[PDB]
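User: For a benchmark we're assembling, each entry needs the component sequences followed by a predicted structure for the full assembly. Here are entry 17's components. Please fill in the structure.
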Amino acid sequence: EDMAKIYGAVAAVSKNVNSSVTYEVKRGTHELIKVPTIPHNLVLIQSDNGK
Amino acid sequence: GEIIYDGGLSSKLADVVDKTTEPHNADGAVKDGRIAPVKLDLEKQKLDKL
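Assistant: Structure for entry 17:
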């Protein structure tokens, strides 16, 4: 029983080893939008007689 | 005549999952005794606790 407790403690510290890290690479990314209409700014001014 | 071979159960070499899976270690015939991968919330576009 004493040996079982000693072997258990040793195995516990052997299992305390890291494997990897996982994360997300999202900094710098932004969401795009869509503009449906071209913003022209033209008006036509004509005289009453059309001259 | 008598039917000797009419097909049967077909063994498949591979099981291809159709769903995106989170990173993981071995859990089948091989069991990874190391700590599972640590998940870190590293890249934040807005400050949270700073």
